[PDB]
């Protein structure tokens, strides 16, 4: 089965998933001097005030915070999107050291971690159908740098002990994802794919320019999770990031000059 190890890592995924070497794969390096400022791009519209979080799950490849997506409660609208996208889950990718961990890079610079808030397009009625369409998903990417602590992330960090191994889940109600956003909503946008198996090319990527700060202690807690199940040899959940993929015939547009 696929993973991030020496024998089942990113460079092996193409054997089981032939879309790994596709025309619009993610992540990519964001060349800030080559990105095209587009004045037709509208501001992002994030409406998370009615968000309803339910559970936190260790799925073996990261931890996911899941949300009730049965109604328009937490939606992403605006920017380069047409229609309403509902929040279904968020997760992180992080490193073994502070100098790596993000999937995206900015002028080849790696950040300590990257947060992905995953949304699906409501005209296709369920997440399962949205992943089979080219405009099916909208993912909000936010870079994490080590420096001051993020008060709004501690609730997530404190529960990691309860979901140490693959398959473990815990009740996680009343979590507000508005505590993880940066001050500015300026962003880069490009058409891409999921950064993990089945690597479907159904994502409009929205990467924020401003990163958020987390403490060494906070990111250290992420590094104590396990890829393995309970009663199995301990393999620390670290370096769960896919390296940059070629841009090919794609243009990165920026919302700011």
Cα 241 from chain centroid?
10
- Told to judge if 61 belongs to the known catalytic residues of this protein, a careful annotator would answer yes
Shortest separation between residue 36's beta carbon and Zn ion, angstroms: 25
Cα 88 from chain centroid?
12
Task: Point out the catalytic residue in the list 33, 61, 104, 119.
Answer: 61
Site string for Zn ion, 60-99 (x = CB under 5 A): ----------------------------------------
Q: Is 93 annotated as a binding residue?
A: yes
Shortest separation between residue 158's beta carbon and Zn ion, angstroms: 22
Shortest separation between residue 86's beta carbon and Zn ion, angstroms: 17
Shortest separation between residue 137's beta carbon and Zn ion, angstroms: 11
- In this structure, how many other beta carbons lie within 10 angstroms of the beta carbon of residue 47? 16
Strand pairing category for 53-58 and 36-37: unpaired
- 26 vs 16: CA distance, rounded Å: 17
Q: Is 195 annotated as a binding residue?
A: yes
Q: Is 221 in the site for Zn ion (CB under 5 A)?
A: no
> Buried b vs exposed e over 116-139: b needs ≥16 C-beta within 10 Å?
bbbbbbeebeebeebbeeebbbbb
- 136 vs 124: CA distance, rounded Å: 8
Interactions with Zn ion, residue window 195-214 (CB under 5 A): none
Q: Residue 37 pairs with which residues in a beta bridge?
A: 254
Shortest separation between residue 91's beta carbon and Zn ion, angstroms: 5
Select from 26-34, 39-47, 109-117, 209-217 the region that touches Zn ion (CB under 5 A).
109-117
Q: Which one of residues 104, 116, 166, 221 is an interface residue with Zn ion (CB under 5 A)?
A: 116
Interactions with Zn ion, residue window 146-165 (CB under 5 A): none
Select from 112-120, 220-228, 229-237, 241-249 the region that touches Zn ion (CB under 5 A).
112-120
Strand pairing category for 212-214 and 29-30: unpaired
3-state helix, strand, coil in the chain (%, to 5): 15, 30, 55
**188 versus 233: smaller Cβ distance to Zn ion:** 188
> Buried b vs exposed e over 140-172: b needs ≥16 C-beta within 10 Å?
bbbbbebeeebeebbbbbebbeebebbebbeeb
Q: Is 119 annotated as a binding residue?
A: no
Known binding site for Zn(2+): residues? 91, 93, 116
Active-site positions?
61
Known binding-site residues for substrate equal 195-196
Q: Write out the residues near Zn ion by the rule CB under 5 A.
A: 116
Q: Which residues are annotated as a binding site?
A: 91, 93, 116, 195-196
């Amino acid at each position: 089965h696929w993973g991030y190890g020496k024998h089942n890592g990113p460079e092996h995924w193409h054997k089981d998933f032939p879309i790994a070497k596709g025309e619009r794969q993610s992540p990519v390096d964001i060349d800030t001097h080559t990105a095209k400022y587009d004045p037709s791009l509208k501001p992002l519209s994030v409406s998370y005030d009615q968000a309803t979080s339910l559970r936190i799950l260790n799925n073996g490849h990261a931890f996911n915070v899941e949300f009730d997506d049965s109604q328009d409660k937490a939606v992403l609208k605006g920017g380069p999107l047409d229609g309403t996208y509902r929040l279904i889950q968020f997760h992180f990718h992080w490193g073994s050291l502070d100098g790596q961990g993000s999937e995206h890079t900015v002028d080849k610079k790696k950040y300590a971690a990257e947060l992905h808030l995953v949304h699906w397009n409501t005209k296709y009625g369920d997440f399962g159908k949205a992943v089979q369409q080219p405009d099916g998903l909208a993912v909000l990417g936010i870079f994490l740098k080590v420096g001051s602590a993020k008060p709004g992330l501690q609730k997530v960090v404190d529960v990691l002990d309860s979901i140490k191994t693959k398959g473990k889940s815990a009740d996680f109600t009343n979590f507000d994802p508005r505590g993880l956003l940066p001050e500015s909503l300026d962003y880069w946008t490009y058409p891409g794919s999921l950064t993990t198996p089945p690597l479907l090319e159904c994502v409009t990527w929205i990467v924020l320019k401003e990163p958020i700060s987390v403490s060494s202690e906070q990111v250290l807690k992420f590094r104590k999770l396990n890829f393995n199940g309970e009663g199995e040899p301990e393999e620390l959940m670290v370096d769960n990031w896919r390296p940059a993929q070629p841009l090919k015939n794609r243009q990165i547009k920026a919302s700011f000059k």
